Amino acid sequence: SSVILTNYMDTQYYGEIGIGTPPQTFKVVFDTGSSNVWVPSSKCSRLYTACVYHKLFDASDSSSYKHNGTELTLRYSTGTVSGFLSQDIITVGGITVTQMFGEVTEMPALPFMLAEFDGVVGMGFIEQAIGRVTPIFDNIISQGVLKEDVFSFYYNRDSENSQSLGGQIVLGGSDPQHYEGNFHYINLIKTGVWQIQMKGVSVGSSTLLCEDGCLALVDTGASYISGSTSSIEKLMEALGAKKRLFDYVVKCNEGPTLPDISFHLGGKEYTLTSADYVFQESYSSKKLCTLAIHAMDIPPPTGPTWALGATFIRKFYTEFDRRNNRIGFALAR
Ligand SMILES: CCc1nc(N)nc(N)c1-c1ccc2c(c1)N(CCNC(C)=O)C(=O)C(C)(C)S2
Ligand SMILES: *[C@@H]1O[C@H](CO)[C@@H](O)[C@H](O)[C@H]1NC(C)=O
């Protein structure tokens, strides 16, 4: 099953799922970086403007609902949400699984007032699941309907014409329609986290990063590519970029000439070009352009580490293999 994803500024990719009976529609992201499923709850106080600007799941409207009510909190790098648990059927691209999801009731304006989507569908292992709530892709594998215990992602480039698909997530395989060449898999440095071994990050002619190795989290739930303040500060100095509050910028007219950044993975350089990582809004020297690379200090047990978000996935189609604890990579198409 494949699920079309909408592209919002190269910073937000989400598809559609259906919770309840009758189905109550929800825009959600498929986050390989988390492990729970949550959606804005109808029980959320409208003092959280975020809930006023999003879709709310009501249980008094689903006959296929099963109350639980345990409270949980999902802490993300860029923001936190909170609420209680509930169970009900969920429809994801043709498949139907009964799931335990988070009915969020505390959803902060900043950042969620900037969420084009409503909730999140964790694609990570149950090992990271908060509340030990069985993840969904696990629930789907319990059906033995998928041809392969793998799911892939395809993030497109923010096109300006409503006709191109923002992206696509296939459950059970890897659509050939969007990658050329063949996949190059790397094994997970451990099962329970979609993280792998990275053998250096190079910026042109100088592997002035991740020498002696480092960790790499393949996060479809992250907008950009991140490292640790140390790593980034050093990378960001090698470009002539300036630090702001939440990102870096380089006089726009110098973006087409920034250098390549290659991420050594599994024994194959994955290279990115200025065009790949810079939001080239303008070509002037009197304006500033943002880099699709940020600093994020991911806390253990996963951190410190680099995060390979949508900036990196836009160039390389990703396959997530649950059956072999390995992540595949192919050039985007
Ligand atoms: C998709 C959930 C998610 N998963 C992980 N692993 N990390 C995150 N930082 C987020 C997470 C949380 C909140 C926001 C956010 C991402 N993003 C980035 C969206 N990322 C993608 C891949 O679509 C936003 O833009 C805000 C609305 C500010 S709020
Ligand atoms: C919620 O689900 C968990 C998962 O097994 C279960 O143990 C618990 O009893 C449920 N909560 C309640 C109060 O029903």
Swiss-Prot record:
Residue span, Peptidase A1 domain: 13-330
Active site: D31, D219
Keywords, ordered alphabetically: Aspartyl protease, Cleavage on pair of basic residues, Disease variant, Disulfide bond, Glycoprotein, Hydrolase, Membrane, Protease, Secreted, Signal, Zymogen
Glycosylation sites: N68
Top-rank lineage group of the source organism: Eukaryota
Enzyme Commission number(s) from the entry: 3.4.23.15
One Gene Ontology cellular component: plasma membrane
Catalytic activity as recorded in UniProt: Cleavage of Leu-|-Xaa bond in angiotensinogen to generate angiotensin I
Chief location of this protein within or outside the cell: secreted
Residue ranges crossing the lipid bilayer per the database entry: none
Biological process according to GO: amyloid-beta metabolic process; angiotensin maturation; cell maturation; cellular response to xenobiotic stimulus; drinking behavior; hormone-mediated signaling pathway; juxtaglomerular apparatus development; kidney development
Cited function: Renin is a highly specific endopeptidase, whose only known function is to generate angiotensin I from angiotensinogen in the plasma, initiating a cascade of reactions that produce an elevation of blood pressure and increased sodium retention by the kidney.
SUBUNIT field: Interacts with ATP6AP2.
Similarity comment: Belongs to the peptidase A1 family.
Protein name: Renin
Organism lineage: Eukaryota, Metazoa, Chordata, Craniata, Vertebrata
Full protein: residues contained: 74 to 406 of 406
